[PDB]
Amino acid sequence: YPEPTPIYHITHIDNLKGILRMGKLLAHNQSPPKQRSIAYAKVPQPPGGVLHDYVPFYFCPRSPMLYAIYSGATEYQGGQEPILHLVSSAQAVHKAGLPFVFTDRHGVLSHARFFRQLEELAQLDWEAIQASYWADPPELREKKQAAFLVYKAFPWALIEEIAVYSQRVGEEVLKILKQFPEARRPRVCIRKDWYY
Ligand SMILES: NC(=O)c1ccc[n+]([C@@H]2C[C@H](COP(=O)(O)OP(=O)(O)OC[C@H]3O[C@@H](n4cnc5c(N)ncnc54)[C@H](O)[C@@H]3O)[C@@H](O)[C@H]2O)c1
């Protein structure tokens, strides 16, 4: 498995002020003050609960979820340009002492496997996760959506990089970061190769 093991959370730039003000991402069930959601299940490892009790990450950028945004398949119609990739690592979460679990596919699938030890990152399909071509077979899309789940909240200061589609969005991100001079200022990188 890649070490450190990057984890990616995609979110609309309109959510960044709320993340910086709270100093964290909040799990769905912890009522984040979201401005845009990009939406179109029990967790059997401790600390248990359901998927929406965790802040979720993928193990790749340019995810199938981002393709659904790009293709207008979400209720959200603003497309990929305003969507940030927030980058951290699985090892940082462990080092910070935060409870996590991770899956080998979307956890709602009956055959989904759940893990809580970093050595079990070997159980994931890294061919699917890292694939640039994932149209067929259908299982590639499923296994590409392996997720890293952090219970209840994810501190902003674990984010190492904000990746953006364009110069204009990179500049907007820096304007927002400068409104919270106490908040960690990660590097901001234009990564067109992480988008469609
Ligand atoms: N976003 C991802 O990278 C990702 C990864 C894995 C799975 N998923 C699932 C795909 C599906 C839709 O995703 P999404 O729109 O992220 O989930 P969601 O519909 O649960 O909406 C939560 C939203 O709140 C945002 N948010 C969190 N904390 C704050 C805060 N402090 N202030 C402002 N906004 C905040 C978060 O970034 C996200 O946009 C959900 O079922 C997710 O669990 C998403």
Curated annotation (Swiss-Prot):
It is an enzyme of class 2 (transferase). The record marks R141 as: Specifically recognizes first thymidine of consensus sequence 5'-TGTC-3'. The gene is darT. Interacts with cognate antitoxin DarG (via C-terminus); this heterodimeric complex neutralizes the toxic effect of DarT by preventing ssDNA binding to DarT and consequently inactivating the toxin by direct protein-protein interactions. GO terms for molecular function: DNA binding; glycosyltransferase activity; nucleotidyltransferase activity. This is DNA ADP-ribosyl transferase. InterPro entries: DarT. NAD(+) binds at H9, I10, T11, G18, L26. Belongs to the DarT ADP-ribosyltransferase family. The NAD(+)-binding element stabilizes the ADP-ribosylating turn-turn (ARTT) loop which confers substrate specificity; both domains contribute to ssDNA-binding. The lineage of its organism: Bacteria, Thermotogati, Deinococcota, Deinococci, Thermales. Its EC number is 2.4.2.-. Keywords: DNA-binding, Glycosyltransferase, Nucleotidyltransferase, Toxin-antitoxin system, Transferase. It comes from Thermus sp. (strain 2.9). Residues 5-196 form the DarT domain. It catalyses: a thymidine in DNA + NAD(+) = an N-(ADP-alpha-D-ribosyl)-thymidine in DNA + nicotinamide + H(+). Residues 103-147 are annotated as: ADP-ribosylating turn-turn loop. The active site is at A147.
